[PDB]
């Protein structure tokens, strides 16, 4: 099971909870403030879109007190979702770089180890050789 | 020229499909909304520029329903191309980190190869010594 899609496609769905808590709690607290067009929810939906990605147009925004603290929470998730998307393109770009690391070190190591090995056999062949010169020559 | 330009110059061209589906669909759905100058395409082009990079000026933007969902798609590609120009450069400088890695391994290897097998040279060396202590001293 991917734990990259339960990390990226799981904090991008938690990102929508900051896009649905931005045109929902700062649009309700914007239905009667001096200069409130962020009144309706369906119309103040273009609000938490220019907040997250911090595009910031201006056709939708608050002027209240508790409509601003429920706004700064929206631009925080926008950045929280950008570092996450970054973490899933470095999960599969480095999983390729991971195919690299495993193929390289497993090749050089198993290869070198056996190079040590051969050296050892150099020994065996030699010990056995000497043995033959040994006991089998005196008796 | 590997899957770098087919990764970078392939998602920056998929970026243009969010710049051409952003002054094209949210500019058509903006030709009769209360406060529509995002009507004309040639004039509503400064729209998907302030969306992607999330500059967000305000002289061009929608108030419709299906002119907003075809807008959030534009600022998404703006960041996607930022994580991309991020992968193109890390490709360059780590392509030099994998080059210094080439020098590193060849110096670590050639020093583990010739000064190592040199031991086997002597392994036999001392073996030929007893092969000779025995039948140089006995027969």
């Amino acid at each position, epitope marked *: 099971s991917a734990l990259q899609w339960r990390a990226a496609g799981a904090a991008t769905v938690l990102l929508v909870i900051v896009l649905l808590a931005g045109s929902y709690l700062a649009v309700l607290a914007e239905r009667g403030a001096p200069g409130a067009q962020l009144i309706t929810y369906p119309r103040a939906l273009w609000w938490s879109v220019e907040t997250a990605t911090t595009v910031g147009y201006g056709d939708l925004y608050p002027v209240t007190l508790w409509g601003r603290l429920v706004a700064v929470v929206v631009m925080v998730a926008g950045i929280t979702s950008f570092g996450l998307v970054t973490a899933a393109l470095a999960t599969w770009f480095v999983g390729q770089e991971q195919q690299q690391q495993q193929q390289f070190v497993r090749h050089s190591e198993k290869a070198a180890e056996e190079a040590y090995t051969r050296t050892t*056999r150099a020994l065996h*062949e030699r010990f056995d*050789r000497l043995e*033959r*010169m040994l006991d089998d020559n005196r008796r | 020229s590997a899957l770098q330009w087919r990764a970078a110059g392939a998602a920056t061209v998929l970026l243009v499909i969010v710049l051409l589906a952003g002054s094209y669909l949210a500019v058509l759905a903006e030709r009769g909304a209360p406060g529509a100058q995002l009507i004309t395409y040639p004039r509503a082009l400064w729209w998907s520029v302030e969306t992607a990079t999330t500059v967000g000026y305000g002289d061009l933007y929608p108030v419709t329903l299906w002119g907003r969902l075809v807008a959030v798609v534009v600022m998404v590609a703006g960041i996607t191309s930022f994580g991309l120009v991020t992968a193109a450069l890390a490709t360059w400088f780590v392509g030099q980190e994998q080059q210094q890695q080439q020098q590193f391994v060849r110096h670590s290897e050639k020093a583990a190869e010739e000064a190592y097998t040199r031991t086997t040279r002597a392994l036999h060396e001392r073996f030929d010594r007893l*092969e000779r202590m025995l039948d*140089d001293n006995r*027969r």
Partner: antibody
Amino acid sequence: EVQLVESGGGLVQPGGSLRLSCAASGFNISSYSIHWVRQAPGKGLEWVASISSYYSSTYYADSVKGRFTISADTSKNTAYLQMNSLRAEDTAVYYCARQPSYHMYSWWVALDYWGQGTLVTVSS
Amino acid sequence: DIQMTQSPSSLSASVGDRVTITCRASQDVNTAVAWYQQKPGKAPKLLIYSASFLESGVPSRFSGSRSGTDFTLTISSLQPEDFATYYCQQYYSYSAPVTFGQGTKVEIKR
């Protein structure tokens, strides 16, 4: 019932290539060593290269160096002497024989059983 | 890299005779010298292996000797079918174990 089988000798213009195969048949070459000994045509006995497939070793004669390559596959059961830059003097009767490796006392018998040999004719 | 000098090239003698072939080495072999009798046409046959003992199927008339460096094959009571070429080989060296000498060819004198 042991015996050896050289195969592959033939006719090759000088500086050509050839592969002889010493098909073994009574023992596992796994624990034995295969020699390749070529007698010239009408001249005396000469050793070329040998291989102890048990230790991971090989040995070639000073008569041939960058040209021959004795090697062996144990999955099948054969040794192969590989000839590459065949000179006009490489023409001969190529035999192959065994000797036990360095193991018990058997190594002291040396070229215990030979095969009949194949003829290699190097000439333009 | 050990060398070998057999002796002599060839020889003449009648059957029932006593033939002795020497070989002399260029270095210390201990007892890794072997004797082979080859009958024109077929491959060599093994005669003596430790330069001391003989193969498990050889005429008892074949004897091996050693003087540290000099080895000598000897055939007491030479028969009528011992007419072949004889090769003295050694298997002590660490080149490989093979090295044969210029062989001796025993033809008969009638």
